[PDB]
């Protein structure tokens, strides 16, 4: 129903920089939260950042003060500016989008996941 395409990943030298993007598609009116996750090889998903329609940003301590998630309502995109990338930042970064709909007995939530962009820092 909602489709997300990610672009921006790649190989960057330690201490460098990277900007990731995630364009949403489909029904984009019920989406309330959109964030980024990373899966280190051999480990499970972790939270990198989270934004909502209203600009309330949630980060992770390991990346607090470095990564900056922002939104662009013109094209329904979320960016993730990753400065000062240490080698421990290499992972596969995925996008999220929460669809929330409210009816006569309660809300319903549907999570949509992007494709994943591999980011390698070396």
């Amino acid at each position: 129903q909602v489709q997300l395409v990610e672009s921006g990943g790649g190989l960057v030298q330690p201490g460098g920089s990277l900007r990731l993007s995630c364009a949403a598609s489909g029904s984009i009116s019920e989406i309330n939260v959109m964030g980024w996750y990373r899966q280190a090889p051999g480990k499970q998903r972790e939270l990198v950042a989270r934004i909502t329609t209203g600009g309330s940003t949630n980060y992770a301590d390991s990346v607090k003060g470095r990564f900056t998630i922002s939104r662009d309502n013109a094209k329904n995109t979320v960016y993730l500016q990753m400065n000062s990338l240490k080698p421990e930042d290499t992972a596969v970064y995925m996008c999220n989008a929460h669809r929330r709909v409210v009816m006569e007995w309660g809300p319903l939530g549907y999570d949509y996941w992007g494709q994943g962009t591999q980011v390698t820092v070396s």
Binding site: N32, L47, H98, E104, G106, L108
Partner: protein
Amino acid sequence: LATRISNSGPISIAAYCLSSILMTVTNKYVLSGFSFNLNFFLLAVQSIVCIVTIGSLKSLNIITYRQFNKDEAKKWSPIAFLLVAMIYTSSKALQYLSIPVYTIFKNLTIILIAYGEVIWFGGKVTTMALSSFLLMVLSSVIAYYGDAFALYLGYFWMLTNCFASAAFVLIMRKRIKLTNFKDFDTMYYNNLLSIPILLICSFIFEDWSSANVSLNFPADNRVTTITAMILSGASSVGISYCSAWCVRVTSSTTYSMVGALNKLPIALSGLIFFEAAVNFWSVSSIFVGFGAGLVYAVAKQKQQKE
């Protein structure tokens, strides 16, 4: 005064719209950053909140309702099964269909409840009342206009919701009359029996993997998730009482028409308090919906005098 208000038709209607407005506001404007894709477990938590809410009021000697009965829970089971049936089929309907298309089909069920109340409860559907049903479908059509297998499953899970939603109100309203249930007995049984079904449905039909659990219940934010899981269920106390209240006094048709009119204040709020477009296909949707309510109201006046 608790008796005159209890058997009041207009008041049950007004209290139902207020409780629907309050519940939609909490889940859309107060809890905007909330993310929870374990639908049946959160709805089971809502029924737990309403159970402890009225169970504590009765234990404080404020309100009073009937004791739990084994022979009366076995007779309320079809209604509780149907209540979760609408929940399951609508969640599966909205995974392939949108909200605007969901409302088109949900306003097409009032024509089916109106003609089910006639067959089972006796009566007639007037022409003035019928034209108001088609004016709510028109407002839905106007508002909406402003994989092949996937869209086949979209309407399959939507026609099954139409049958489960129509059967729920018709069967429930019948059962508040051979039991002489009040609005707290109906609320008590609708929630007590729905807890085990919603929990069992959440076990088999939902993802309880290590990664989806830690995505729904983050360890770095537990007070926020628990708080939002209780504010989301405390706003449904009013709509749980006022749904059974409205059905008992007025009708299953009137309760369904009021539910369709409960989405017009939300639409008008978006056009004033938010950025929602003011194009012709969104202003004439509200105006046409208002005409549907004002034609249904006069239709029942003529029917009352006929």
